[PDB]
Design a protein around this ligand. Structure first.
Ligand code: CL7
Ligand code: CL7
Ligand code: CL7
Ligand code: CL7
Ligand code: CL7
Ligand code: CL7
Ligand code: CL7
Ligand SMILES: C=Cc1c(C)c2cc3nc(c4c5[nH]c(cc6nc(cc1[nH]2)C(C)=C6CC)c(C)c5C(=O)[C@@H]4C(=O)OC)[C@@H](CCC(=O)OC/C=C(\C)CCC[C@H](C)CCC[C@H](C)CCCC(C)C)[C@@H]3C
Ligand SMILES: CCCCCCCCCCCCCCCC(=O)OC[C@H](COP(=O)(O)OC[C@@H](O)CO)OC(=O)CCCCCCCCCCCCCCC
Ligand SMILES: CC1=C(C/C=C(\C)CCC[C@H](C)CCC[C@H](C)CCCC(C)C)C(=O)c2ccccc2C1=O
Ligand code: SF4
Ligand code: SF4
Ligand code: SF4
Lengths: 67, 35, 136, 80, 30, 147, 29, 132, 658
């Protein structure tokens, strides 16, 4: 759960990276519902049809995340 | 680099596998069942 | 009363149809530095006259396509979009606050903001015959 | 018309609002997120349903979700 | 009533189909 | 003769085909558009013209063609088509609200199409005209054949 | 082999479900 | 259903035979080889019965398939260990040293399979397996 | 605009979408505005009486037409050479040539040969005159009158059954098992014993004399006292001719087994016995007599009942040709092919319908909380697994079956048929009415296996992923049928659950097509005596194309030529109609909405700008069909085409052969 680096398995059911280890890269912001900003190795589906790259980092929920 | 790239790597590998199977079939006759 | 000069355009077939009269036109009014030439969204090239130019288009998306893609590219960000009813009710829509919706401004409520995140939305099985939707 | 609902996880990137071709979406001020903004959808009588907004949203389980129903002249995108 | 075919068929297909299409037209346009 | 746009924002180009004098003369004086006709009259002329025209394909091309009975086919077929169009006018008018809008070709279309009263009048015209047309064309076909 | 009396009665019977179908249809609308 | 030798149809087929290989004797050699297998009386065409027929070539097939699968798996492990970012020039560009090592460690999968099965090394926990 | 009354969302649509979506949603009573579960069940209840009235008026039509226009009498006299007749043709469009050609089966005027084994079925159940049929018809019209009267009375608040009578599903289940199934089963044995079997044994039973007649001399005394023996009297001799005194026995309940040789059909006595047994078992089980979800969801109920009727109609088809229960139907090849193909295609429709309503259940009715750890919850728990396995068996069965067929094609083409991978169906031999299962049969069975696997793969990936997926986590939100989620995430076209029913209908048609293709080719081979043709040529795919499709098409497509018409004209034409309809399905499946919407915009322009024409205008703004309507019309064309083409071909293949 450390801001510089971590290994959190996401428990957000509506997530591309549910049950995937991710390295946090931002400090949990005071008053932010979802401040984890975990970076996952795999890309998301995000993008227009035939967009190769997608999203690597999402602001994951603290409750959903788990060290 | 070109060698590393899938298309050339695969081209060589399959031009080998295909030729290998062609050569096998060329030498050994029609093998329907293991003798 | 939404007065400008119509951009010099030879006419097309891409313009307003019966619905313009019967129901609701739109109008985009912008201030041009120069008499430059722009792609008409109806299809064609028109030449915007010097100063205030008024264009009667057939849907909001046509207006917002001229604006967002061509005018804003020409750095002309003075454009105002008016829903025009047959009676002549001209109603400013796009910059309703006078500021482009991308820039956050006060006195604009959060509309259809949902507390619960996408994940937590209720299953329809539960709400069957209540008449409430998942997002609602 | 199409209901556009913005969910909790809006990181206020202003991507949707710049996408929307009928400017249904206004970036309004919101204390919920670090961004200091959220997405609002006042003008959903002008929602064509293109979902360029959803397409542009970068959040996993995108906050902006468009729900198509009760097609009107303005939804159906009819010049005529 | 050998002829009943030559009456029932146009009645149902042409006249009934016509009347049905007319009625459905009124129904979906009113 | 050049293409120009009256009210350039409207999707209607004046062309030698829609805005020419010869054309405007013809179109605006066809019984749909011609000024100072009772709707019934508009319909009676449209009907007569179409019935009379319609007789020909049916009499000429249909299954019993060549025979004497072809003339009767022609007339009944054309009249059937006119009756179907009569139905179409009635049901159309029943559910229609829309008025003919002024166009490039026809600046003053009129109200005979555009009011339920108008369409009923036109349809009564159209029916009598059309079936009359068709009968006249069969009568003339028999006449000319005999002569 | 089927007589006209019979063809007519069959039609007249079939008319009954016709009326009742109109009735049920109306109901279900 | 009856040995090809026994079946009279098969002998007819043998008499007039098409030579596959350049050598004239390929046709006769093929039929001579096929004599062993059982063939249907009317057809006189060799049939395959679900050990020599299917089991043995099944085993050979499975060995080769396991080899190529294992080699690919091993190379995937090599990919995720060689560099911090596996895909870039790890899949699109094929590391020949890593690949040849993977192939050499391939074809030993039958012996390797016992060890892999032990402690469920091959299987990853359901909890870990990403599924929405 | 008022229509559709039930949906204001649609009723305020200013476009033609209003009319289409109306007709599309006009029976989704659940989704009607202000529909409470109570009214929903009551409405549904009344509709069902409508449906049944239709089925009865349908049957009524069958009997009325065969009576009035048929040759049922002439046929009962010569049931092996007389072609049975479905109804008269009155068509003002026929030329003299075509009236002559359709003037067949010794009919005065132009007729349609029947191919539903209705003549056979009616002869078997005892009907022997046009009077029996005419009375059946008038009766069935009156039954339908009653069923309609019933639905009317029921929806009337006087007899409007409240939510209670429907919430009592368990009672309905037991009632169905006994009071309906059991009761009707033994009632049917009643008919069999009293009318079928007598009339079979040459003895006329009318409604007037059956009170007079006793089925069994000592049978009435035997009942309840050594009933089994007396009932098993003198069994009908092989000599016995159906509907004649010659060789007539007296037994009414038997276990003779096999087939009556004259008619090549199951012994009526064996059938009567069967039904009596079935009745006893059903009534006993009735007396003797996922719960949550099944009662909760009407979708779960239909789904289950459709999967049920699916397997039932499949087995009906499988049994009704192997174990003919109707007189002379085994000899009437066109009818037997027709009925098999019919019931198999209806099987596939009912099956896929099961999985459709499955997915509807999973998006409208399934509450994960409600059932904590039910079968369904476990099914979803490891979707990825159920799908990966079905996927694997599909890729496996597929790769190998196609590979083997392609191998066989290649080697046979190269002129070395020896090298074919001919695998004998050993287990089929072990199990074996049963026809020789060769290596052809093996390959086709595996084809059908694979195709049925891919079908269930699809129509479960559908009903499982209906709730959602990584590409669209919240599908339940958008519902069963919706176009897509847009081009958002690499693109989401055909991501709905409805899309899975759509994608699986194709596989259902492929699967049943392989089934009925195999059926009909095998049978045409045997019915021509060239079972060799099937056995030799069924192992490579050119053999199917050359011998089945190419070879059996010739008669059909010569139905009309420049030289002239024959009776097969109408089938040749339907054959083409089905090709056209099918291909038209490709128009809608391949060209998608946007192309059309642009085009229709230009036509709206042209209409508004054309003098004289502009006088009329649409009430409903013309728009291209919806994304989903495109898929649906596509599929209905493709399907209708598929069925009509094959029906034409089945009839045209078998009819000249006989
Ligand atoms: C150029 C086409 C060709 C290809 C691709 C090819 N061979 Mg041959 N080829 C061989 C194997 C082989 C392998 C393992 C292989 C792998 O793909 C191939 N080939 C492939 C050996 C059996 C043999 C050479 C072995 C040798 O000693 O090396 C062989 C031949 C031979 C030829 C010829 C002409 C070929 N080939 C041809 C080819 C001998 O006469 C000559 C006979
Ligand atoms: C339903 C299947 C069918 C189809 C698809 C079909 N026919 Mg036939 N069909 C015919 C043509 C035809 C055409 C051109 C055509 C093209 O699509 C078709 N068909 C198609 C004719 C030969 C024949 C005649 C039918 C018959 O005569 O129909 C009436 C024809 C009419 C009302 C249309 C004439 C069109 C005008 C000329 C247009 C001119 C416009 C003008 C330029 C505008 C400017 C005006 C002014 C401002 C200057 C017909 C038959 C007939 C039948 C039947 C049953 C059919 N068909 C059947 C079909 C006759 O019995 C019957 C039979 O007797 O055959 C001999
Ligand atoms: C639907 C409302 C309606 C009713 C109830 C009705 N007609 Mg009409 N109707 C006629 C008879 C009639 C009879 C004998 C009759 C009652 O016994 C009715 N109608 C009744 C014919 C004299 C006359 C022409 C023939 C006529 O259309 O059909 C003959 C009438 C039949 C067999 C009796 C059945 C009653 C039907 C409910 C009427 C069917 C009309 C339908 C809309 C069109 C069907 C297809 C058509 C192309 C044939 C007629 C007209 C016509 C119309 C229209 C719109 C109607 N109708 C409409 C109706 C023509 O324009 C049309 C028009 O030409 O007249 C102005
Ligand atoms: C695709 C055409 C279609 C078919 C084949 C069909 N319906 Mg519907 N359908 C019904 C059931 C039904 C049953 C039991 C049934 C057959 O099993 C069908 N349908 C069949 C009832 C709910 C309802 C009863 C319609 C009702 O009013 O039917 C009138 C009865 C008839 C024609 C008279 C028949 C005898 C002619 C002397 C119905 C509707 C309706 C429609 C429409 C358009 C349909 N349908 C459509 C169809 C109403 O709007 C209308 C609607 O308002 O629904 C909300
Ligand atoms: C009166 C008893 C009767 C019944 C029950 C009946 N027909 Mg016929 N009927 C036909 C079909 C048919 C079908 C599909 C059908 C089954 O429902 C019936 N019929 C049933 C066509 C073969 C032919 C077409 C002409 C035409 O259809 O003739 C009129 C037929 C009528 C008065 C009978 C109506 C009674 C039906 C029970 C209604 C069924 C409605 C349906 C359940 C509701 C759902 C609709 C669905 C589409 C979604 C026909 C004939 C014809 C007649 C006649 C007199 C009949 N019939 C009579 C009947 C022609 O002359 C004439 C004939 O002589 O042809 C040469
Ligand atoms: C084909 C598989 C299938 C079957 C067998 C089936 N359903 Mg469903 N099914 C319904 C009931 C039902 C009943 C009572 C029932 C009884 O057995 C079935 N179903 C069965 C309603 C609950 C619900 C409402 C359905 C719906 O509202 O019904 C209205 C649909 C209409 C009038 C269109 C019907 C037109 C036919 C498509 C095409 C006919 C072509 C014809 C041959 C002409 C040929 C010309 C000639 C050459 C021969 C329904 C659903 C639906 C679907 C789907 C896909 C299905 N189904 C599928 C099936 C909805 O999405 C849809 C849904 O809304 O889900 C959310
Ligand atoms: C390109 C067409 C083709 C395909 C797709 C194909 N084979 Mg062959 N292929 C084999 C089986 C096989 C299987 C199980 C299989 C599918 O999984 C295939 N094939 C696939 C082995 C029996 C055998 C190695 C083989 C042959 C052979 C041939 C030939 C010509 C083929 N094939 C051809 C094909 C032998 O000479 C050669 C031979 O004559 O054996 C009969
Ligand atoms: C001839 C028609 C046709 C074929 C061959 C086909 C093929 C397949 N469809 C699949 C699935 C589907 N098809 C679907 C919808 C449809 N599919 C259709 C038509 C077909 N689909 C149509 C009309 C529809 C409606 C849209 C769905 C919805 C699915 C699936 O979910 C299902 C699937 O993917 O399951 C996992 C697979 C089912 C068999 C399997 O899993 O592996 C067996 C593979 C087979 C039988 C064909 C493989 C072809 C050969 C062996 C591959 C190599 C060929 C060459 C060597 C390749 C190199 C070529 C270069 C040299 C140029 C398979 C890929
Ligand atoms: C025999 C008859 C002809 C058969 C083939 C006809 C195909 C025509 C299909 C339309 C293509 C027109 C050109 C579009 C070209 C084009 O840009 O298409 C576009 C298409 C998809 O582009 P997208 O927009 O989806 O990609 C999105 C990105 O651009 C950014 O989002 O690309 C592909 O199809 C990918 C596959 C390319 C090719 C994959 C195969 C690679 C090996 C091919 C080897 C060929 C050997 C040739 C030797 C002579
Ligand atoms: C051809 C085609 C069209 C155009 C076809 C349309 C718009 C239907 C054309 C009209 C049909 C022929 C009949 C409509 C007119 C009838 C006269 C209606 C009579 C019924 C009234 C009473 C309602 C699509 O819209 C479309 C949409 C999505 C995927 C594929 C396709 C597609 O292939
Ligand atoms: S929903 Fe997406 S685009 Fe819209 S404001 Fe939130 S993060 Fe930005
Ligand atoms: S659907 Fe399209 S037009 Fe409608 S709100 Fe989203 S981005 Fe804006
Ligand atoms: S259905 Fe059409 S609109 Fe939707 S994702 Fe597919 S291509 Fe885009």
């Amino acid at each position: 759960m450390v801001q510089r680096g971590s290994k959190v398995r996401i428990l957000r059911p509506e997530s591309y990276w549910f049950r995937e280890i991710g390295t946090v890269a931002s400090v949990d912001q005071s008053g932010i519902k979802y401040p984890v900003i975990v970076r996952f190795d795999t890309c998301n589906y995000n993008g227009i049809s035939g967009t190769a790259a997608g999203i690597n980092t999402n602001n994951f929920g603290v409750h959903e995340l788990e060290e | 680099k070109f060698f590393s790239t899938a298309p050339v790597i695969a081209l060589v590998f399959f031009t080998l596998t295909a030729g290998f199977l062609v050569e096998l079939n060329r030498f050994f006759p029609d093998i329907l069942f293991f003798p | 009363t939404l007065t400008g000069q119509t951009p010099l355009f030879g006419g097309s077939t891409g313009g307003l149809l019966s619905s313009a009269e019967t129901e609701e036109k739109y109008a985009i009014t912008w201030t041009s530095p120069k008499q430059q030439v722009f792609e008409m969204p109806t299809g064609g090239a028109a030449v915007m006259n010097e100063g205030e130019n008024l264009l009667y288009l057939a849907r909001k998306e046509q207006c917002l396509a001229l604006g967002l893609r061509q005018l804003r590219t020409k750095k002309i960000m003075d454009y105002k979009i008016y829903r025009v009813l047959p009676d002549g009710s001209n109603t400013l829509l796009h910059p309703k606050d006078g500021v482009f919706p991308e820039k956050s401004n006060e006195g604009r409520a959060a509309v259809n903001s949902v507390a619960r995140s996408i994940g937590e939305n209720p299953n329809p099985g539960a709400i069957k015959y209540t008449g409430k939707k998942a997002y609602d | 018309s199409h209901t556009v609902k913005i969910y909790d996880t809006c990181i206020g990137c202003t991507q949707c609002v710049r996408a929307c071709p009928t400017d249904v979406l206004e970036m309004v001020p919101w204390d919920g997120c670090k961004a200091g903004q959220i997405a609002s959808s006042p003008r959903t009588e002008d929602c064509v349903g293109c979902k360029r907004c959803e397409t542009a949203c970068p959040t996993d389980f995108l906050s902006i979700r468009v729900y198509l129903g009760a097609e009107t002249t303005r939804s159906m995108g009819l010049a005529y | 009533s050998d002829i009943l075919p030559a009456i029932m068929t146009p009645l149902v297909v042409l006249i009934g189909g016509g009347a049905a299409m007319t009625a459905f037209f009124y129904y979906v346009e009113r | 003769l050049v293409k120009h746009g009256g009210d350039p924002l409207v999707g209607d180009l004046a062309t030698p085909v829609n805005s020419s004098g010869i054309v405007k003369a013809w179109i605006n004086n066809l019984p749909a558009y011609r000024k100072g006709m009772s709707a019934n009259a508009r319909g009676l002329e449209i009907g007569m013209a179409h019935g009379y025209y319609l007789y020909g394909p049916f009499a000429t091309s249909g299954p019993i063609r060549g025979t004497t009975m072809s003339l009767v086919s022609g007339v009944l077929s054309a009249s059937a088509v006119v009756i179907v169009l009569s139905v179409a006018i009635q049901i159309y008018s029943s559910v229609s609200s829309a008025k003919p809008l002024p166009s490039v070709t026809t600046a003053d279309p009129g109200s005979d199409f555009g009011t339920k009263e108008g369409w009923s009048a036109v349809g009564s015209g159209f029916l009598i005209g059309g079936c009359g047309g068709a009968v006249i064309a069969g009568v003339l076909s028999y006449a000319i054949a005999a002569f | 082999e089927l007589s006209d009396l019979q063809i007519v009665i069959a039609l007249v019977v079939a008319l009954l479900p016709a009326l009742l179908a109109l009735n049920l249809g109306s109901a279900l609308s | 259903l009856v040995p090809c030798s026994e079946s009279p149809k098969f002998q007819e087929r043998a008499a007039k035979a098409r030579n596959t290989t350049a050598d004239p004797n390929s046709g006769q050699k093929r039929f001579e080889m096929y004599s062993s297998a059982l063939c249907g009386p009317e057809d006189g065409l060799p049939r395959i019965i679900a050990a020599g027929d299917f089991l043995i070539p099944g085993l050979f097939f499975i060995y080769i398939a396991g080899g190529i699968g294992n080699s690919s798996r091993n190379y995937q492990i090599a990919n995720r260990k060689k560099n911090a970012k596996n895909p870039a020039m790890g899949e699109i560009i094929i590391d020949v040293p890593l690949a040849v090592s993977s192939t050499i460690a391939g074809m030993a999968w039958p012996l390797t399979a016992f060890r892999e099965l032990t402690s469920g090394e091959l299987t990853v926990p359901d909890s870990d397996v990403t599924v929405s | 605009t008022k229509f559709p009354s039930f949906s204001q969302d649609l009723a305020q649509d200013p476009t033609t979408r209003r009319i289409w979506y109306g007709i599309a949603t006009v029976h989704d009573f659940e989704t009607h505005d202000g529909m409470t579960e109570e009214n929903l069940y009551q409405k549904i209840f009344a509709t069902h009486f409508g449906h049944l009235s239709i089925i009865f008026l349908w049957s009524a039509g069958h009997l009325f037409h065969v009576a009035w226009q048929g040759n049922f009498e002439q046929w009962i006299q010569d049931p092996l050479t007389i072609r049975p007749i479905a109804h008269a043709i009155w068509d003002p469009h026929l030329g003299d040539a075509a009236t002559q050609a359709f003037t067949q089966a010794g009919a005065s005027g132009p007729v349609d040969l029947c191919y539903s084994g209705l003549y056979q079925w009616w002869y078997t159940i005892g009907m022997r005159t046009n009077g029996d049929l005419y009375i059946g018809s008038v009766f069935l019209m009156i039954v339908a009158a009653v069923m309609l009267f019933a639905g009317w009375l029921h929806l009337q608040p006087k007899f409007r059954p409240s939510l209670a009578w429907f919430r009592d599903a368990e009672s309905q289940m037991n009632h169905h098992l006994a009071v309906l199934f059991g009761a009707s089963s033994l009632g049917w044995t009643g008919h069999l014993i009293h009318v079928a079997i007598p009339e079979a044994r040459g003895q006329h039973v009318g409604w007037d004399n059956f009170l007079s007649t006793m089925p069994h001399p000592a049978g009435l005394a035997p009942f309840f006292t050594g009933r089994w023996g007396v009932y098993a009297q003198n069994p009908d001799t092989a000599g016995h001719i159906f509907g004649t005194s010659e060789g007539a026995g007296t037994a009414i309940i038997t276990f003779i087994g096999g087939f009556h040789p004259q008619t090549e059909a199951l012994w009526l006595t064996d059938i009567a016995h069967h039904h009596l047994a079935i009745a006893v078992m059903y009534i006993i089980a009735g007396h003797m007599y996922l719960y949550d979800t099944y009662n909760e969801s009407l979708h779960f109920q239909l789904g289950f009942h459709l999967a049920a009727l699916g397997v039932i109609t499949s087995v009906v088809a499988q049994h009704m040709y192997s174990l003919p229960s109707y007189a002379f139907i085994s000899q009437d090849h066109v009818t037997q092919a027709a009925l098999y193909t019919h019931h198999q295609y209806i099987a596939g429709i009912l099956a896929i319908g099961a999985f459709a309503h499955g997915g509807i259940f999973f998006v409208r009715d399934y509450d994960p909380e409600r059932n904590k750890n039910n079968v369904l919850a476990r099914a979803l728990e490891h979707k990825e697994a159920i799908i990966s396995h079905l996927s694997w068996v599909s890729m496996f069965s597929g790769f190998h079956t196609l590979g083997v067929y392609v191998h066989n094609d290649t080697v046979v083409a190269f002129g070395t048929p020896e090298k074919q991978i001919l695998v004998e169906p050993i287990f089929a031999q072990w199990i074996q009415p049963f026809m020789s299962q060769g290596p052809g049969d093996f390959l086709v069975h595996h084809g059908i296996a694979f195709s049925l696997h891919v079908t269930v793969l699809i129509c479960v990936k559908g009903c499982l992923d209906a709730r959602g997926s990584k590409l669209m986590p919240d599908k339940k939100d958008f519902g069963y049928s919706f176009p897509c989620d847009g081009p958002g995430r690499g693109g989401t076209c055909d991501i709905s659950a409805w899309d899975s029913f759509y994608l699986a209908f194709f596989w259902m048609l492929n699967t049943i097509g392989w089934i009925v293709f195999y059926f009909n080719w095998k049978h045409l081979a045997i019915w021509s005596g060239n079972e060799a043709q099937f056995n030799t040529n069924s192992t490579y795919l050119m053999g199917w194309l050359r011998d089945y499709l190419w070879g059996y098409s010739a008669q059909l497509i010569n139905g009309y030529t420049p030289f002239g018409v024959n009776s097969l004209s109408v089938w040749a034409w339907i054959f083409l109609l089905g090709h056209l309809c099918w291909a038209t399905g490709f128009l809608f499946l391949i060209s998608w909405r946007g192309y059309w919407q642009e085009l229709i915009e230009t036509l709206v322009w042209a209409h508004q700008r054309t003098p004289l024409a502009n006088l009329v205008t649409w009430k409903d703004k013309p728009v291209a069909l919806s994304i989903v309507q495109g898929r649906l019309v596509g599929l209905v064309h493709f399907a209708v085409g598929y069925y009509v083409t094959y029906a034409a071909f089945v009839i045209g293949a078998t009819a000249p052969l006989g």
